[PDB]
Amino acid sequence: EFQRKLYKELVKNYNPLERPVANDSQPLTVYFSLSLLQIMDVDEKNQVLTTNIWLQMSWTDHYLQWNVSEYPGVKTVRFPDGQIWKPDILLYNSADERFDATFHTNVLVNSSGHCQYLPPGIFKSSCYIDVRWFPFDVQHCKLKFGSWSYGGWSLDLQMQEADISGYIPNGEWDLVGIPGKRSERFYECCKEPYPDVTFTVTMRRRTLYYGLNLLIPCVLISALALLVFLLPADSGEKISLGITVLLSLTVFMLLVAEIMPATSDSVPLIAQYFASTMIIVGLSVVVTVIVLQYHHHDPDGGKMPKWTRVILLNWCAWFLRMKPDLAKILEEVRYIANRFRCQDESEAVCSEWKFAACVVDRLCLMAFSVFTIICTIGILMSAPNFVEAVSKDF
Amino acid sequence: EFQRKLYKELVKNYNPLERPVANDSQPLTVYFSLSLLQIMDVDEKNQVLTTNIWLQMSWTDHYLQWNVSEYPGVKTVRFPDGQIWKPDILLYNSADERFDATFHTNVLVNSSGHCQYLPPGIFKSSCYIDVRWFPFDVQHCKLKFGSWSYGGWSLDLQMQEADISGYIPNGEWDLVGIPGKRSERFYECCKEPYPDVTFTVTMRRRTLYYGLNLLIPCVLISALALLVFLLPADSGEKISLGITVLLSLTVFMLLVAEIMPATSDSVPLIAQYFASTMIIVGLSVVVTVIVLQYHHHDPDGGKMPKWTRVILLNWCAWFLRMKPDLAKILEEVRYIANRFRCQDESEAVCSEWKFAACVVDRLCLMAFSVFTIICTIGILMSAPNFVEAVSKDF
Amino acid sequence: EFQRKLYKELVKNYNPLERPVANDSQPLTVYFSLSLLQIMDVDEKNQVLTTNIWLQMSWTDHYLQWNVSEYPGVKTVRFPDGQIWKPDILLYNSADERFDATFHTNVLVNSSGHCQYLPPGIFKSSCYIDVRWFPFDVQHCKLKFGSWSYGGWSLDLQMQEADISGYIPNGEWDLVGIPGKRSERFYECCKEPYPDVTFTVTMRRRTLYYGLNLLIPCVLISALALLVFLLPADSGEKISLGITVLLSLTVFMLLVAEIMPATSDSVPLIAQYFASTMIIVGLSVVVTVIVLQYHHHDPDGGKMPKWTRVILLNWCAWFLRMKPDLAKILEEVRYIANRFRCQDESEAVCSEWKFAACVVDRLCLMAFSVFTIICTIGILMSAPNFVEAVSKDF
Amino acid sequence: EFQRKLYKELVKNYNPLERPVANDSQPLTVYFSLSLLQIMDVDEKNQVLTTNIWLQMSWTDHYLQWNVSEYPGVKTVRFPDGQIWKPDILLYNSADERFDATFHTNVLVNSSGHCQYLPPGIFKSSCYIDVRWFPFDVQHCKLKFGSWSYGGWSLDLQMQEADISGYIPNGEWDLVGIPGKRSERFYECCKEPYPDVTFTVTMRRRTLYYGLNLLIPCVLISALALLVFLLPADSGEKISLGITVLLSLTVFMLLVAEIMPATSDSVPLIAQYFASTMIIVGLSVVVTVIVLQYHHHDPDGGKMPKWTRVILLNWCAWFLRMKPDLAKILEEVRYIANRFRCQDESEAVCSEWKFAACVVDRLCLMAFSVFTIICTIGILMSAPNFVEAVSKDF
Amino acid sequence: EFQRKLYKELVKNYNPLERPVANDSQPLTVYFSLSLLQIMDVDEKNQVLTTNIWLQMSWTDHYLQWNVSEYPGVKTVRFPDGQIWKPDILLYNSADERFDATFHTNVLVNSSGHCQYLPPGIFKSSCYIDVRWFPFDVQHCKLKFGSWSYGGWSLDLQMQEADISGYIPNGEWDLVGIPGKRSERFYECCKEPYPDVTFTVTMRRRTLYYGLNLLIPCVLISALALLVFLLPADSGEKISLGITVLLSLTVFMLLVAEIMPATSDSVPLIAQYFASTMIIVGLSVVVTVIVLQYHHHDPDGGKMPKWTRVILLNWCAWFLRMKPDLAKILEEVRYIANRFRCQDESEAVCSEWKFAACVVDRLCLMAFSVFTIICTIGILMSAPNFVEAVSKDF
Ligand SMILES: CCCCCCCCCCCCCCCC
């Protein structure tokens, strides 16, 4: 009854097109804040951030006032979209197909005219994602809010500190903070400020998933490629091991494909590490082929060069600490024995080529193990957030 | 005719903005329940629960009353959205792009004014999914409902036990229960309660799919890696078997990729088991290479150390229960025979290295079989719901 | 002119909220049918059926009547959504995000008041899909239609036989039939029936795609694993063949992954067949390793046991129908010859171990071929619809 | 001013429910055409065609007429949806979730009452796709348009030739043509025609993508399988080559999976060709195993049968154009020499088995090369559109 | 108060159907521009461009004028969709399911009647994408804007230079420019121009992603195939290396599949390069098989032809710079020695076939290395934008 009288009275001559100020020259203050509930997606390719956010707007409507003694029990009235005036505050850098992601709830007003509008939404904002340091990257995503048509002398947009009391932690990203900043804009025509409120969402990528599902499968496969150097050449499986390890890494590259970004703004750190892994495993297969040329060298081919003999068999091998009728019977038997002697001389030349190949294996083992470690620790710890990341995620 | 008169009479001076109470100071009770028909999706990455739910709301409209003797045959009237007042009860933790998932059906009212509103919907709710114990994980998803703008002195939200009589069992999740709880909230300004009704949907992941399409393909591939230790070194296929088993497991890791979650909140149990499998198969290839170094050891290399001879050939091998012209003719023939004697001495040294490699194979077989079983049974039975899970799903 | 007069006359005092009966106590009959044009999707995971369906509703509006002599040429009038009354018949088990999939076309009415409403739609219905017998499964999907708010004394819902004259045959599913059944419901409060009309869409999965893209690639790969038993042990490729066949089957398991359902309600028939295939191929690699232990057995190891010699070399091999100076010269020459004699004795022991391995190969060939055939024909023909399926699809 | 007067005058007593004819018994002619801009998708699984189309409708409104001398400068008026009458022409075989894909633009009317309505849309139509001859298939997709509620005595639907002047050529499909045909329908009740206008979009699949990304990768892999027959048996890599080629083809089958349709209406031509490829490569591995049994046949096994010796070594090999103290010393030396003689006899028997295997290799080479070519050229040129397709696409 | 009076005054007799000109014969000028914020997607298959764009429209409304001295403080009024007249400027080549992607914001008007409409949107436009030169391709996408129903004497559409001040650089595409051009159209009926404004978005594909994730993995795998020629034939792993490299390339072809376009309008440059890679690796396996036939040639087969001996062993090998009782004892011993002599003659014939195979390896190495380099540099540098692309992206 009092409620029914009040609602009928409040809408009389009310124009939702009117900015509700007692003085049309003076400004209308709007307090803008938001409440971040979730970070939903950080899409690299589309360059979009998806968040669950409750916007908070407060302002005063000069016309929606009543004395509560004259309307006992009626302390607040609600109005649905299109019935009272509302600030046209929109997310400027919206990437949503609708552009306005808000669900238009009721606007709460008390007897003094204080309006409270709490539109929820699943916002999509345009954000430049820098994947240079991926997986250890850190993003700074701006959420720029302002009025679509009212300058600062009409809609004076003020800012209130963002709320994160109901924030759900994500499993992919840390929330560092969501500071806001009210900034004015100026047109050369005029002196009027044009305010906006930008909340910069700062978020750190969690790296436990990437450590356990990429580095460990990648380091382990990268270590098996070095295992070729410990495998004898007589196993007949040195190429089998190395080329199948490369094949495994080709198969693993498909998993890496899905998660990897797809940009040309930089080479991601993760792409450097996996790219390097490929080269080291590819070169291991190369030196394996060179080793087998030594191991299977023809005994009746080119004599071991002096420099080959000097470098491998002496210096490197020291550094590595390796190291009537009866007369014709005499003729035939001697032929058999001297043939065994030639066979043994060729076997000894072959043994020297085989030891040269063992020495090249030990050198390739050391060289590749060192290169592997220095490329792993160097690429990974290059990231400015590496130590922090491992400290918080492991 | 009576119906037409009643509908015209009921809308006269009716304001859908008005909370329909005879006394504007007294509260309006709303009975809130839901009916769960389906659990549609439990998305780990988005942290969203998708459910088919029929909401149930009941309340009394003071204005929608008539005497049925004066309107014979007209016992109930229906009203579409926006014509009568409705409670603004919304899912607070909604993750839907629309935020309101309900389909606004008609509100049923009888002659006494009892309103019944049964909005169906496909709701999307924000839920923290804990995949620590995946596949044996259990989720507890809150569905928090309340009025967007009416405190407890205005909209007194009461709760009724949720219905599951029309629940369709899922193929991925058990339904443990859906208990509800009415909880009040307080603001330091005021003494008024702010009620909400939270239905906590508790659901257990069924594990038959994961047993049959992951463990069995994973255990079987994990067992073939142990088969390398029974394969002779003379087959020339020991690396072929082990490295192709690893390759198969790299290929299987791609299938595992799709289903696995993608978080850094914890290491899922399934990730521990598959990660361990990789290490055990990788190490099997490592010890295989060590075995081949023994099998293919040069007869003219370093003599079998004392400790090598003691450890392998004696202790471990016992534990395993393994164990003129004519004178020149004499010269040449003796050379041939003494050459055969040296060849046999080198063959015997080689046989002792080969038996050392057979002993290392039997030891690696036992060690890896034990490690495999203890990591399988230990990781799997670590899950607090393991015994239950297997009891209900197998 | 007559049309314009009629439309103005019909809407005078017309309330689209009013159920259009001359007597408000008597019921309003609604004839409900549908026309199935397409089966669009049978989604296992979501438990949803997608269909193209034209609903058919007929009823009488007491108010939309005119004499055609007074309105010459005007025999029918059409009305768009929200202008005249409409039955609130909805699909109860809808799984659509909108819940109402219908496109609200015009309602056709003739001079006698007979209304005809033909809403088309792409309906999504909740359906339990039973994939126990997949690919030979048969689904029975209910489409339950009724009025959201009118009991049987108000809206008397009658059923008419469903039309399939414009049905487009699917490439994935046969249409067995779409019988309907009008069923009443009762509440313990009251005696009034609450009717619904359920059309049960019965559909058989076509199996030609699954025969040609799974069984044949699976049987062929399953046959190559048995080919290992015909491969000699001297090829040096027995493990290569078997383990690469398993690798191929691991690669094929990824294709199988996409199409396979993902439930824990049962083990699908297809999952049993492929799971069995894995075991048989895995065990083939196991017995291959055992065969190579016989083939490569050390001549100076443990003597062939009696039972090994009895079982393999006699019984199984029969069942398979297999089967001064001069004196020192004498000393040296005799050493050479007796060494050749020992070498030949060891070669003969080795030949007996090698024949034992050939016998185990022939036995493993027979055993695995029989197991393979019995598991293929047994799993496949277990399906209650197997013979029919092959008869209609091949 | 004249425009403002005209718009106010035209809407006076205008009913958008009224079919706008001067005589309510006479029909209203509607000229229907469309303009095809793009073919967007031909989805096999969903059985849907997606097209960008501008519909064209023309008709006369008896009421929207004015004299332009009385309204100088005002020659045309536009009206938005729901303000004037519009034909309810819809795509009958629509597969869109909205069913009406049109964007409701303004209707253009001149002073004589000629209305022009040009609704654009992205239409989804139900089309049976026949993939029997895929990749050389040709589709004929009907777009059936008619009025939802007006028979031919009310809405006389006439047809105008479709426009393709603004058609964007597709990269996947040729446009053969889009002929239309006006067809009447009759109900046994009545004599009134029920017209529809069906535009049959005829489109040929372009095959360059499928030639270059499937046939060439498939023929090349199919040729490498035949390369096994030229590889010597002493390489020790014959199974390695063949089984890895099959593995590669298993890996290639995954790419084939994505693009292949998924129906059981027929076996696609592409499925026959790839299915045949599998069999030929599988059988190549089979005959390779048979070849190795000949190559590695035991010298002390079963003597080469007469028919084996006759068939292979003579006929096929011709067709292929292949082809005191001293006495004991005598005893020991003779033993050594006669042992070498037996070894050479066994080597010669082995050489004859090895040549038999070379002959089986040359025969298997010829047989498989011929089978391969005849299955490639036969399957491919079976397609009725093969020669045309290659002529237009290559 | 002044604002409320003004809004009430402006809507009095205002018709949003009226083009707002003082003279109905004279035209209404509309200044059209846009502001490009983002390039979101360049979809090859759908032939669609997705962009984030703020449209800019300016025009004069004759009716929305007031004197600001009479309305102090009220300098601008805003109006929502459907309240004032708006130009019906649409994107003609729209590929959006809604066709109108704009979010209808308020129209800003000042006291002089100057209207400003700034609709944002995520536009989808139909664009022919030419992937002939992919990854070095350059696209020219037209965005054709015009009025749906107003010719040039009614709506005179003028163009203003497009803004890119708020353009976010993409990670996949450079923005070369967005020039616009106002073009008139003529109908043979009439002399009136029909203007449109086309902004041609020109954009260059960035190629760093494609260099690092395709060329390098492709060149490296293409180089390992050439490594077969350096591998000795005695390793027993030449086919293993080559066929596994091909297998790896088959696995890599799956990654290539996802990113590759799917058209038959041309063969993309990337498809030529990868297709060529396959042939070169396939042929390497072919020549490897030929090499092994030489290496494993039977010593007792066909004598090395003259031309074979001349070509390989002389010319090519020079170009490559390679190069009583006692009498019976005599009989037996001579048999042993002459047998060793025959064995050595066969070993020497075999050595000559083996050196012929080494020569064919060195020739195949040179031939394939040259072919590889010329096909890589030739295909890649064929692209007209190659040098630029590498200069800007590397
Ligand atoms: C992906 C990891 C596996 C998760 C499922 C565990 C299942 C364990 C099954 C143990 C064996 C049960 C046999 C009962 C008798 C039929």
Short mmCIF file of C-alpha atoms in Angstrom, two decimals, chain E residues 1-239:
data_model
loop_
_atom_site.label_atom_id
_atom_site.label_comp_id
_atom_site.label_asym_id
_atom_site.label_seq_id
_atom_site.Cartn_x
_atom_site.Cartn_y
_atom_site.Cartn_z
CA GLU E 1 14.73 20.49 -14.99
CA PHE E 2 16.03 22.14 -18.14
CA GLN E 3 17.22 18.70 -19.21
CA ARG E 4 13.80 17.21 -18.46
CA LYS E 5 12.06 19.98 -20.39
CA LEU E 6 14.41 19.52 -23.35
CA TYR E 7 13.98 15.74 -23.62
CA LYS E 8 10.20 16.08 -23.49
CA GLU E 9 10.36 18.86 -26.08
CA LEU E 10 12.67 17.05 -28.50
CA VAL E 11 10.55 13.89 -28.77
CA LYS E 12 7.30 15.78 -29.47
CA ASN E 13 6.16 14.66 -32.96
CA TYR E 14 9.53 13.02 -33.63
CA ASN E 15 9.35 10.04 -35.96
CA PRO E 16 12.41 7.73 -35.94
CA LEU E 17 11.31 6.55 -39.40
CA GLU E 18 11.99 10.02 -40.86
CA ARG E 19 15.29 10.87 -42.50
CA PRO E 20 15.91 14.19 -40.64
CA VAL E 21 16.33 16.84 -43.40
CA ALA E 22 14.68 20.30 -43.52
CA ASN E 23 14.15 19.74 -47.31
CA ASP E 24 12.92 16.21 -48.29
CA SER E 25 14.42 16.59 -51.80
CA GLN E 26 17.91 17.49 -50.58
CA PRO E 27 20.33 14.81 -49.35
CA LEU E 28 21.50 14.01 -45.85
CA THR E 29 25.24 13.80 -45.47
CA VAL E 30 26.72 11.04 -43.30
CA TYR E 31 30.42 11.04 -42.48
CA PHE E 32 31.59 7.45 -42.09
CA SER E 33 34.87 6.31 -40.60
CA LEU E 34 36.05 3.46 -38.45
CA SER E 35 38.71 2.82 -35.84
CA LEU E 36 40.54 -0.49 -36.01
CA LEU E 37 41.53 -1.83 -32.58
CA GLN E 38 42.44 -5.44 -33.36
CA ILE E 39 42.71 -8.06 -36.05
CA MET E 40 41.24 -11.09 -34.32
CA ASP E 41 41.17 -13.91 -36.87
CA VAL E 42 41.96 -14.61 -40.54
CA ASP E 43 40.21 -17.89 -41.03
CA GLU E 44 41.31 -19.59 -44.25
CA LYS E 45 38.66 -22.33 -44.38
CA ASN E 46 35.64 -20.15 -43.60
CA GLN E 47 37.07 -17.28 -45.72
CA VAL E 48 36.29 -14.82 -42.90
CA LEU E 49 38.13 -11.94 -41.24
CA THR E 50 37.37 -11.20 -37.57
CA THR E 51 38.20 -7.68 -36.35
CA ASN E 52 37.53 -5.42 -33.38
CA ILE E 53 36.35 -2.13 -34.87
CA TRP E 54 34.63 1.02 -33.61
CA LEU E 55 32.50 2.51 -36.37
CA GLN E 56 32.14 6.29 -36.50
CA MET E 57 29.10 8.01 -37.99
CA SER E 58 28.27 11.72 -38.00
CA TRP E 59 25.26 13.52 -39.43
CA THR E 60 22.86 16.38 -38.71
CA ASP E 61 19.33 15.95 -37.40
CA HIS E 62 17.23 18.97 -38.35
CA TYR E 63 14.83 18.36 -35.46
CA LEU E 64 17.24 17.84 -32.54
CA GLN E 65 18.20 21.51 -32.13
CA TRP E 66 17.80 23.88 -29.22
CA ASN E 67 19.20 27.17 -27.96
CA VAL E 68 21.49 26.52 -24.99
CA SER E 69 20.68 29.90 -23.44
CA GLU E 70 17.10 28.68 -23.00
CA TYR E 71 18.36 25.36 -21.55
CA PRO E 72 21.33 26.41 -19.41
CA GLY E 73 23.73 23.61 -18.60
CA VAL E 74 22.19 21.25 -21.18
CA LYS E 75 24.67 21.17 -24.05
CA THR E 76 24.22 17.56 -25.21
CA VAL E 77 21.44 14.95 -25.16
CA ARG E 78 21.81 11.20 -25.70
CA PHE E 79 19.21 8.85 -27.20
CA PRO E 80 19.11 5.02 -27.16
CA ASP E 81 18.39 2.73 -30.12
CA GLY E 82 14.99 3.13 -31.74
CA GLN E 83 14.24 6.60 -30.32
CA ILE E 84 15.85 8.86 -32.94
CA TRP E 85 16.63 8.25 -36.59
CA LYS E 86 19.86 6.47 -37.41
CA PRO E 87 21.66 5.75 -40.70
CA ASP E 88 21.17 2.15 -41.81
CA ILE E 89 24.85 1.73 -42.71
CA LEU E 90 25.75 -1.96 -42.65
CA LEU E 91 28.76 -4.06 -43.58
CA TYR E 92 27.70 -5.53 -46.92
CA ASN E 93 30.20 -8.41 -46.96
CA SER E 94 29.35 -9.54 -43.44
CA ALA E 95 29.87 -13.20 -42.56
CA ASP E 96 28.27 -13.02 -39.10
CA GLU E 97 25.28 -15.15 -38.13
CA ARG E 98 23.61 -11.93 -36.94
CA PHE E 99 24.85 -9.88 -39.97
CA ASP E 100 24.84 -6.75 -37.75
CA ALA E 101 27.76 -7.03 -35.32
CA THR E 102 27.38 -3.54 -33.84
CA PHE E 103 26.46 -2.87 -30.23
CA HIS E 104 23.86 -0.11 -30.42
CA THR E 105 25.15 2.56 -28.04
CA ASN E 106 23.62 6.01 -27.52
CA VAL E 107 23.70 8.65 -30.23
CA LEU E 108 25.25 11.91 -29.04
CA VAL E 109 23.69 15.18 -30.24
CA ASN E 110 24.61 18.77 -29.39
CA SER E 111 22.40 21.87 -29.47
CA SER E 112 23.18 22.44 -33.16
CA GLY E 113 21.86 18.98 -34.09
CA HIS E 114 25.19 17.34 -34.88
CA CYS E 115 24.69 13.63 -34.19
CA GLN E 116 27.58 11.32 -33.27
CA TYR E 117 27.08 7.54 -33.26
CA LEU E 118 30.03 5.32 -32.24
CA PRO E 119 28.85 1.69 -32.43
CA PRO E 120 31.54 -0.84 -31.41
CA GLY E 121 31.56 -4.39 -32.67
CA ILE E 122 33.42 -7.60 -33.37
CA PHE E 123 32.85 -7.76 -37.11
CA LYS E 124 33.07 -10.86 -39.30
CA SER E 125 33.62 -10.04 -42.97
CA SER E 126 33.78 -12.28 -46.02
CA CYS E 127 37.33 -12.17 -47.40
CA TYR E 128 39.05 -14.23 -50.06
CA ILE E 129 42.28 -15.46 -48.45
CA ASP E 130 45.04 -16.31 -50.92
CA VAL E 131 47.34 -18.91 -49.36
CA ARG E 132 49.44 -19.46 -52.50
CA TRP E 133 52.45 -17.85 -50.80
CA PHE E 134 51.74 -19.10 -47.27
CA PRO E 135 53.58 -18.57 -44.89
CA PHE E 136 54.72 -15.40 -46.76
CA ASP E 137 51.25 -14.45 -47.90
CA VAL E 138 49.68 -11.01 -47.84
CA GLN E 139 45.95 -10.46 -47.62
CA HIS E 140 43.78 -7.59 -48.82
CA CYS E 141 40.40 -7.73 -47.11
CA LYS E 142 37.63 -5.37 -48.10
CA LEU E 143 35.15 -3.97 -45.59
CA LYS E 144 32.35 -2.57 -47.73
CA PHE E 145 29.96 -0.23 -45.89
CA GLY E 146 26.88 1.48 -47.27
CA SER E 147 23.26 2.25 -46.55
CA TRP E 148 20.89 -0.67 -47.04
CA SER E 149 18.09 1.44 -48.59
CA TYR E 150 19.08 5.09 -49.26
CA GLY E 151 20.65 6.18 -52.52
CA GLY E 152 23.02 9.10 -52.81
CA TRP E 153 20.35 11.77 -53.24
CA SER E 154 18.89 10.67 -49.89
CA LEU E 155 21.88 9.47 -47.86
CA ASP E 156 25.04 11.10 -49.22
CA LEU E 157 27.70 8.86 -47.67
CA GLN E 158 31.06 10.63 -47.31
CA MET E 159 34.28 9.08 -46.04
CA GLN E 160 36.83 10.15 -43.45
CA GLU E 161 40.28 8.65 -43.02
CA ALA E 162 40.30 5.59 -40.79
CA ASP E 163 41.84 5.81 -37.32
CA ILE E 164 44.48 3.36 -36.09
CA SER E 165 45.65 5.33 -33.05
CA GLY E 166 44.23 2.68 -30.71
CA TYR E 167 45.30 -0.31 -32.76
CA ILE E 168 46.70 -3.26 -30.81
CA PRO E 169 49.45 -4.98 -32.83
CA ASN E 170 48.73 -8.62 -33.50
CA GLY E 171 51.14 -11.48 -32.97
CA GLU E 172 50.22 -13.23 -36.22
CA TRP E 173 49.81 -10.38 -38.73
CA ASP E 174 51.36 -7.02 -39.54
CA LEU E 175 49.06 -4.15 -40.38
CA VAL E 176 50.29 -2.54 -43.59
CA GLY E 177 47.43 -0.06 -43.77
CA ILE E 178 43.69 0.41 -43.94
CA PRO E 179 43.03 2.82 -46.82
CA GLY E 180 39.45 3.66 -47.65
CA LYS E 181 37.76 4.70 -50.89
CA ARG E 182 34.31 6.16 -51.53
CA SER E 183 32.91 4.64 -54.74
CA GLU E 184 29.60 5.33 -56.46
CA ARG E 185 27.37 2.75 -58.11
CA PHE E 186 24.85 3.26 -60.90
CA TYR E 187 21.68 1.49 -62.01
CA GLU E 188 20.67 1.67 -65.67
CA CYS E 189 17.24 2.94 -64.56
CA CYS E 190 18.47 6.14 -63.01
CA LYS E 191 21.27 8.69 -62.69
CA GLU E 192 21.47 8.62 -58.88
CA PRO E 193 24.79 7.48 -57.38
CA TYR E 194 24.70 4.67 -54.82
CA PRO E 195 27.73 5.28 -52.60
CA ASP E 196 29.70 2.83 -50.50
CA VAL E 197 32.84 3.18 -48.41
CA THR E 198 35.29 0.29 -48.63
CA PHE E 199 38.18 0.03 -46.17
CA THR E 200 40.72 -2.45 -47.56
CA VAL E 201 42.61 -3.95 -44.63
CA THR E 202 46.05 -5.00 -45.88
CA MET E 203 47.98 -7.34 -43.62
CA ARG E 204 51.18 -9.37 -43.86
CA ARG E 205 51.57 -12.71 -42.14
CA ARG E 206 54.37 -12.77 -39.61
CA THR E 207 56.68 -15.74 -40.29
CA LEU E 208 58.81 -16.18 -37.15
CA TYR E 209 56.45 -18.83 -35.76
CA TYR E 210 56.57 -20.74 -39.03
CA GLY E 211 60.34 -20.48 -39.39
CA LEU E 212 61.04 -21.80 -35.89
CA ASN E 213 58.32 -24.46 -35.57
CA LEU E 214 58.36 -25.82 -39.16
CA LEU E 215 61.43 -25.06 -41.31
CA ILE E 216 63.94 -25.87 -38.58
CA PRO E 217 62.20 -29.11 -37.53
CA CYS E 218 61.74 -29.87 -41.24
CA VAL E 219 65.27 -29.02 -42.42
CA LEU E 220 66.79 -30.94 -39.50
CA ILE E 221 64.73 -34.03 -40.28
CA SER E 222 65.55 -33.52 -43.98
CA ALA E 223 69.25 -33.44 -43.10
CA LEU E 224 69.15 -36.66 -41.09
CA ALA E 225 67.85 -38.46 -44.17
CA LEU E 226 71.05 -37.42 -45.95
CA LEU E 227 73.03 -38.80 -43.00
CA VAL E 228 72.19 -42.33 -44.24
CA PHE E 229 74.76 -41.88 -46.99
CA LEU E 230 77.55 -41.40 -44.46
CA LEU E 231 76.48 -44.44 -42.41
CA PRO E 232 78.43 -47.62 -43.27
CA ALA E 233 76.52 -50.53 -44.74
CA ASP E 234 77.94 -52.82 -42.05
CA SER E 235 76.16 -50.98 -39.23
CA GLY E 236 73.00 -52.84 -40.19
CA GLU E 237 71.02 -49.66 -39.50
CA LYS E 238 70.81 -47.80 -42.84
CA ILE E 239 67.16 -48.67 -43.45
#
